[PDB]
Amino acid sequence: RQSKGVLLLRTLAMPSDTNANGDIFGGWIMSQMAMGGAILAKEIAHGRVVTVAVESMNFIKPISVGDVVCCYGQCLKVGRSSIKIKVEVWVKKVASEPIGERYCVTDAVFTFVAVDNNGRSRTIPRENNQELEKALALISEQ
Amino acid sequence: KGVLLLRTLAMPSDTNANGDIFGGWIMSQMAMGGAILAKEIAHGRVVTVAVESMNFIKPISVGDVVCCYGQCLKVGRSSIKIKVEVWVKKVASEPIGERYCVTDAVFTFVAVDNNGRSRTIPRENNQELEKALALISEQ
Amino acid sequence: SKGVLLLRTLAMPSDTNANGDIFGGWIMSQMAMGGAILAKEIAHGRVVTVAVESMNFIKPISVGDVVCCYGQCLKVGRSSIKIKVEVWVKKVASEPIGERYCVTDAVFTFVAVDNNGRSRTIPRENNQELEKALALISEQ
Amino acid sequence: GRQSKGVLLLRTLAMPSDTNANGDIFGGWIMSQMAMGGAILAKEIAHGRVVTVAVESMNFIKPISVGDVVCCYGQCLKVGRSSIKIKVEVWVKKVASEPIGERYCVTDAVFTFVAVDNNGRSRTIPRENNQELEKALALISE
Amino acid sequence: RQSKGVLLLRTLAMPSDTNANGDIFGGWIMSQMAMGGAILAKEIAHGRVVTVAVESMNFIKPISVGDVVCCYGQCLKVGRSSIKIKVEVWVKKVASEPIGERYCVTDAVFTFVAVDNNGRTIPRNQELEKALALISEQ
Amino acid sequence: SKGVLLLRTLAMPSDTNANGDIFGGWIMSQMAMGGAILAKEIAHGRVVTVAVESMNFIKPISVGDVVCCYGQCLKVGRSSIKIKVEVWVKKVASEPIGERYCVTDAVFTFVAVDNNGRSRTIPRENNQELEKALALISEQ
């Protein structure tokens, strides 16, 4: 298994973000997915967005302190104002064993809505929008 | 809306660029509160395995009181499904006393042992489970 | 667990001290935040936190404990409110399970204020929050 | 003015992340600084671990603003066999905010610590060649 | 100017990481650089590392809340235990004007040392081969 | 010798790295904050960090260490301020008790700026913080 999507975010899992068991807190993972997913939505929307839904999330494997943590995004659908993005969280072992090992720890499907200054719905610009163009192209492949 | 899981104040450190509370913080509160109820029903450790139907309805503002409420929807051998609702109360901003649901979701937890292997939720001596099943029976 | 529930959360690793227990500062912060919510409720708006008295650190909090702050109002003045805050722990995923006890307490004083930070009178009319407060006072 | 009394315990800058809804620094942050500073002097006097057991008094006098320099000063008031009572004052200095140069006391508190062993049980503060204790008692004497 | 090195880290600049000027705190920027550079160092070292030196750091342009922040790294020299990495910090504007704008905001040169889990030499390891190749190129 | 005390705090577990020591990013953060305070005092206002040279990590910091930053201004320009920052620890609750040593140092450059982030001239008039710093530089 390999990642699908573009790289949204990349970071190191730190001790401050652990839970009682010593693994990384699920809340931190959700936040990383949220932040990452939103970057890609803002890119496509050419501006501000809000998250309106997360229809699914699956916590597959735990994350450990010291793991490199990447979030990949695949835009599934673009509406007049909405953007639906699948996010996968992947880890790479760089200083724990087995080194170089990579695997998918978490997934989710987020929905964002393009908004104005007042948080109110706005139409995603369709003209001269390369970021949208790229997404629509990958969607049209299935 | 079920039982009170968590309660706290919305703080400036947890804001987003728009200046509302960051959605990541909200999801983290829902997870923590839901897990507390799951652990109560399970009579010990749980892991979070899934979320479905998370809806962000309204923004949270700095200074809002934030409560998370939980209603257990199903209990399996090891799995617990809990609807978590996030509610805000205006105590020191207008309009004073106003309360409303801002976010909801359904979390699934699995009862686990010390090795992180699933364990059976005890049917014996478990009034937490008895309460959750009676509430489910009322729906 | 005496008085009304102000706050409830889980104790986390990031809030530990060098001994591995929960840092005293975090517990003080939870108390002040919970105490202030009830003061704001009672005051029907803004307050300021002006004093603390008789804070007692009884037992340590452990990572993974459920942490609850309870509030017992002791006095309501024109603008001042004194609240006893008790911090309680519940063991839900550590032994012994279902065990609860009081780990910290303190008395906070708040003052109801207007938008320009001047003191204001806590309304006695249509104030169910105060009514419930004065019932708490009914223990000395 | 009034001038600070005691020895410098802590010095830091008040930061945006530690603000309340009014935009001032949160009271819990100030309490935390006072406890940490107080505890350092207690440990210095006690020659090792202590635990905090009481705060008999705390007064929030004035607010702290983002970008204030914040200092905690400590005065040991009393030393028992294992206990140490310490008055903490919090002072601010304006360096990049108006009016520049102004200093004043914003917060005080009186803390009680107890010297403990590795197991968290009471221990006797060593008196023989304890130069930090000697220094504290000499100040208490006058 | 275009980015040099491989992508180390990518994040969003958040309000909690602001300074008293209202820009993003230099402390946070340095922390990103250290984290990102160490990742590449550990990749080449095939394990744990410590930071021993930062010989240079230059803060070129401020970072703003809501900016996308990327750290890129280029290994300059690999020794027996030592790894030297130039880090560049770049920002991309995605929901502030000018939208689409990218530019370099910070750079630094970090030195790392390969250590075991107490307190070693680098295996000769296709990370090292990619790094040494680029070095031989420049 | 050390210079003046910029900052003093306790190393906390929230600031640890994956090795269990204090994270180097936190140390760099303390140094930048403490050095900026001195720079701000001399500059009679706001500053920004523009450069670091010769940063050396000497020993690790441990949870529960007392951490102090000390500063010595080396040079003042029209708007720039060069400050050597040393980070020291003191053991107060871990062995060996009372031990103190330098764990990090660096040379920081700050630039005096206005409210729009543009460099400004450090005033020579009525500035005794500058006078103080140039006094020590005079000594070499």
Written as one string, the DSSP assignment of F59-123 is: S---TT-EEEEEEEEEEE-SSEEEEEEEEEEE-SSSSSTT-EEEEEEEEEEEEEB-TTS-B-PPP
Cα F53 to chain center, whole Å? 13
Give yes or no for D109 touching C (CB within 8 A): yes
Q: Is the dihedral of CA E95, E97, E100, E103 positive or negative?
A: negative
Q: Which of D17, D18, D21 sits opposite B63 (nearest CB)?
A: D21
φ and ψ at residue A49, rounded to 5 degrees: -135, 160
Element (H, E) at E69: strand E68-78
Q: Under an 8 A CB cutoff, do E53 and F52 touch?
A: no
Round to whole Å and give the CA distance between C18 and A125. Answer: 53
Q: Under an 8 A CB cutoff, do F93 and C14 touch?
A: no
Are E135 and E73 in contact by the 8 Å Cβ rule? The answer is no
- Which one of E57, E110, E113, E117 would you mutate to disrupt binding with F, by most F Cβ within 10 Å of its Cβ? E57
Cα A135 to chain center, whole Å? 14
Judging contact as 3 or more Cβ pairs under 8 Å, the answer for C and B is yes
The residue type of B23 is G
What does the block give as tokens for A27?
């809340």
Q: Which of E21, E27, E58 sits opposite F28 (nearest CB)?
A: E27
Q: Under an 8 A CB cutoff, do E66 and B22 touch?
A: no
CB pairs under 8 A between A and F: 18
Round to whole Å and give the CA distance between C19 and C5. Answer: 29
Residues of A in contact with E12 (CB under 8 A): 9, 35, 38-39
Round to whole Å and give the CA distance between D60 and C14. Answer: 27
Buried residues in F7-21 as b, exposed as e (16+ CB within 10 A): bbbbbbbbbbbbbeb
Closest chain E residue to A14 measured between Cα atoms? E35
Task: Give residues with Cβ within 8 angstroms of A37, minimum separation 6.
Answer: A8, A51, A71, A73, A85, A87, A108, A110, A112
Residues of C in contact with F20 (CB under 8 A): none
Closest chain B residue to D26 measured between Cα atoms? B11
D138: closest CA of chain C, how far (Å): 28
Residue E119 CB coordination number (10 Å): 10
D28: closest CA of chain B, how far (Å): 12
What does the block give as tokens for F125?
């008039």
Round to whole Å and give the CA distance between B117 and B111. Answer: 8
Q: Under an 8 A CB cutoff, do E16 and D16 touch?
A: yes
> Solved by what technique?
X-ray
Q: Under an 8 A CB cutoff, do F33 and D49 touch?
A: no
Residues of A in contact with E95 (CB under 8 A): 42, 47-49
**Residue E108 belongs to domain spanning:** 1-138
Residue D82 CB coordination number (10 Å): 16
Report resolution in angstroms. 1.9
* CB hemisphere CA count around E13 (13 angstroms): 29
Which residues make beta-bridge pairs with A84? A77, A111
Total number of residues shown for chain F: 140
Q: Under an 8 A CB cutoff, do C64 and A25 touch?
A: no
Q: What is the DSSP letter of C65?
A: -
Q: Which residue has the tokens 């340590």?
A: C60
Give yes or no for E9 touching A (CB within 8 A): yes
Name which of A95, A92, A106 is nearest A30 in CA terms. A106
Q: Under an 8 A CB cutoff, do A38 and E12 touch?
A: yes
- Virtual torsion, Cα E55, E60, E66, E67, nearest 10 deg: -90
Closest chain A residue to C16 measured between Cα atoms? A16
Q: Which of residues 110-139 of D touch F (CB under 8 A)?
A: none
Q: Under an 8 A CB cutoff, do F12 and C13 touch?
A: no
Closest chain D residue to B15 measured between Cα atoms? D17
* CB hemisphere CA count around A124 (13 angstroms): 25
Round to whole Å and give the CA distance between B24 and A37. Answer: 11
φ and ψ at residue B110, rounded to 5 degrees: -125, 125
Give yes or no for F98 touching A (CB within 8 A): no
Residue/partner pairs of C56-59 with CB below 8 Å, 24 or more apart:
C56/C104, C56/C105, C56/C106, C56/D53, C56/D54, C57/C24, C57/C27, C57/C103, C57/C104, C57/D51, C57/D52, C57/D53, C57/D54, C58/C102, C58/C103, C58/C104, C58/C105, C59/C89, C59/C101, C59/C102, C59/C103, C59/C104
Round to whole Å and give the CA distance between F48 and B4. Answer: 46
Q: Which of residues 14-73 of F touch C (CB under 8 A)?
A: 14, 63-64
B97: closest CA of chain D, how far (Å): 17
C-alpha distance from residue A14 to each of B55, B100, B112, C14, C63 (Å)? 29, 35, 24, 10, 17
Element (H, E) at A42: helix A26-45
Helices (H) and strands (E) in chain A, counts: 2, 5
Q: Under an 8 A CB cutoff, do C10 and B32 touch?
A: yes
- Show which subunits contact D, needing at least 3 CB pairs below 8 angstroms: B, C, E, F
What does the block give as tokens for D71?
């200092």
Residue E133 CB coordination number (10 Å): 9
User: What's the CATH number where A100 sits?
Assistant: 3.10.129.10
Round to whole Å and give the CA distance between A28 and B24. Answer: 7
Residues of E in contact with D69 (CB under 8 A): none
What does the block give as tokens for A58?
């699956």
Task: Give residues with Cβ within 8 angstroms of F42, minimum separation 6.
Answer: F73, F76, F81, F122, F127, F129, F130, F133
Q: What is the DSSP letter of A15?
A: G
Task: Give residues with Cβ within 8 angstroms of C47, minimum separation 6.
Answer: B92, C36, C39, C40, C81, C110, C111, C112, C113
- Show which subunits contact C, needing at least 3 CB pairs below 8 angstroms: A, B, D, F
Name which of C113, A101, C58, C18 is nearest D114 in CA terms. C58
Q: Which of E10, E42, E99 sits opposite A7 (nearest CB)?
A: E10
Q: Under an 8 A CB cutoff, do F17 and A15 touch?
A: yes
The residue type of C80 is S
Name which of D32, D29, D79, D111 is nearest C54 in CA terms. D111
- Show which subunits contact E, needing at least 3 CB pairs below 8 angstroms: A, B, D, F
- Show which subunits contact F, needing at least 3 CB pairs below 8 angstroms: A, C, D, E
Q: How many domains does chain B have?
A: 1
Residue B118 CB coordination number (10 Å): 16
Residues of E in contact with D16 (CB under 8 A): 15-16, 18-20, 22
Residues of B in contact with D24 (CB under 8 A): none
Which residues make beta-bridge pairs with F90? F66, F100
Q: Under an 8 A CB cutoff, do A27 and B23 touch?
A: no
Task: Give residues with Cβ within 8 angstroms of C51, minimum separation 6.
Answer: C108, C109, D57, D58, D59, D60
Name which of B20, B109, B19, B82 is nearest B57 in CA terms. B20
Which residues make beta-bridge pairs with D108? D59, D89
Which residues make beta-bridge pairs with A91? A69, A103
Q: Is B8 exposed, middle or buried (0-12, 13-18, 19+ CB in 10 A)?
A: buried
Task: Give residues with Cβ within 8 angstroms of E12, minimum separation 6.
Answer: A9, A35, A38, A39, B17, E66, E67, E68, E69
F20: closest CA of chain C, how far (Å): 12
Q: Which of F19, F24, F48 sits opposite E21 (nearest CB)?
A: F48
C-alpha distance from residue D49 to each of D44, D45, F64 (Å)? 9, 10, 10
